[PDB]
Design an enzyme around this catalytic site. Structure first.
Site, PDB file in Angstrom:
ATOM      1  N   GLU A  35       0.812  -1.210   0.000  1.00  0.00           N
ATOM      2  CA  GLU A  35       0.000   0.000   0.000  1.00  0.00           C
ATOM      3  C   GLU A  35       0.850   1.267   0.000  1.00  0.00           C
ATOM      4  OE1 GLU A  35      -2.989   0.483  -0.584  1.00  0.00           O
ATOM      5  OE2 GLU A  35      -3.985  -1.463  -0.196  1.00  0.00           O
ATOM      6  N   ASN A  46      -7.758   9.513  -5.394  1.00  0.00           N
ATOM      7  CA  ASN A  46      -8.577   8.609  -6.192  1.00  0.00           C
ATOM      8  C   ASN A  46      -9.461   9.367  -7.180  1.00  0.00           C
ATOM      9  OD1 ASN A  46      -8.868   7.148  -3.034  1.00  0.00           O
ATOM     10  ND2 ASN A  46      -7.628   6.244  -4.674  1.00  0.00           N
ATOM     11  N   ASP A  48     -12.621   9.257  -7.593  1.00  0.00           N
ATOM     12  CA  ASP A  48     -13.877   9.783  -7.068  1.00  0.00           C
ATOM     13  C   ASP A  48     -13.679  11.039  -6.226  1.00  0.00           C
ATOM     14  OD1 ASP A  48     -12.742   8.702  -4.758  1.00  0.00           O
ATOM     15  OD2 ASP A  48     -14.396   7.323  -4.331  1.00  0.00           O
ATOM     16  N   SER A  50     -11.787  11.250  -3.476  1.00  0.00           N
ATOM     17  CA  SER A  50     -11.275  10.916  -2.158  1.00  0.00           C
ATOM     18  C   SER A  50      -9.762  10.722  -2.215  1.00  0.00           C
ATOM     19  CB  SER A  50     -11.955   9.656  -1.629  1.00  0.00           C
ATOM     20  OG  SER A  50     -11.564   8.500  -2.358  1.00  0.00           O
ATOM     21  N   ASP A  52      -6.394   8.494  -0.229  1.00  0.00           N
ATOM     22  CA  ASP A  52      -5.901   7.468   0.697  1.00  0.00           C
ATOM     23  C   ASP A  52      -4.717   8.008   1.491  1.00  0.00           C
ATOM     24  OD1 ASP A  52      -7.715   5.648  -0.459  1.00  0.00           O
ATOM     25  OD2 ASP A  52      -6.187   4.900  -1.846  1.00  0.00           O
ATOM     26  N   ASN A  59      -8.985   5.434   3.416  1.00  0.00           N
ATOM     27  CA  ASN A  59      -9.649   6.316   2.455  1.00  0.00           C
ATOM     28  C   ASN A  59     -10.586   7.329   3.127  1.00  0.00           C
ATOM     29  OD1 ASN A  59     -12.251   6.608   0.442  1.00  0.00           O
ATOM     30  ND2 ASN A  59     -10.325   6.557  -0.697  1.00  0.00           N
ATOM     31  N   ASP A 101     -15.347  -4.827   9.742  1.00  0.00           N
ATOM     32  CA  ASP A 101     -16.542  -4.335   9.068  1.00  0.00           C
ATOM     33  C   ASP A 101     -17.301  -5.417   8.307  1.00  0.00           C
ATOM     34  OD1 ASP A 101     -18.095  -1.982   8.807  1.00  0.00           O
ATOM     35  OD2 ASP A 101     -17.365  -1.652   6.768  1.00  0.00           O
TER      36      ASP A 101
END
Ligand SMILES: [Cl-]
Ligand code: NA
Length: 129
Positions: A35, A46, A48, A50, A52, A59, A101
């Site tokens: 990562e 990103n 969209d 957003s 990271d 994110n 999650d």
């Protein structure tokens, strides 16, 4: 801070990630390597809108607030900048929420594509833990 392999493994162990939700330590070190290249200051934008953040590339659309991801959530209740610290507490605590999650470590694309199904124990081999 750019961690060494065994240095990060020891820090992750002290923060309680070894076997957390059934994921052995090598899984977490492998995920961090691909990562962020072990760099706590890594950021990536990103498509969209957003971003990271940090050693585990958490994110802003769901997990932290950076003030520029409209309509996003802040499920770890932290500013995203806290994820860039040389102290990994905030990244570890938020990662514990993520992996609980429902989808486990599949939330991390680099883990699914480069760690899952491999000999992840190699990532902690030779370390004093
Ligand atoms: Cl799982
Ligand atoms: Na957010």
């Amino acid at each position: 801070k750019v961690f060494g392999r065994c240095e990060l493994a020891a820090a992750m162990k002290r923060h309680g990630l070894d076997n957390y939700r059934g994921y052995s330590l090598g899984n977490w070190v492998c995920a961090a390597k691909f990562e962020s290249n072990f760099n706590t200051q890594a950021t990536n934008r990103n498509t969209d809108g957003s971003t990271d953040y940090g050693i585990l590339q958490i994110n802003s659309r769901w997990w932290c607030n950076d003030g520029r991801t409209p309509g996003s959530r802040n499920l770890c209740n932290i500013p995203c900048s806290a994820l860039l610290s040389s102290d990994i507490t905030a990244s570890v605590n938020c990662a514990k929420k993520i992996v609980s999650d429902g989808n486990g470590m599949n939330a991390w694309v680099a883990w699914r594509n480069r760690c899952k199904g491999t000999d992840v124990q190699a990532w902690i081999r030779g370390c004093r833990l």
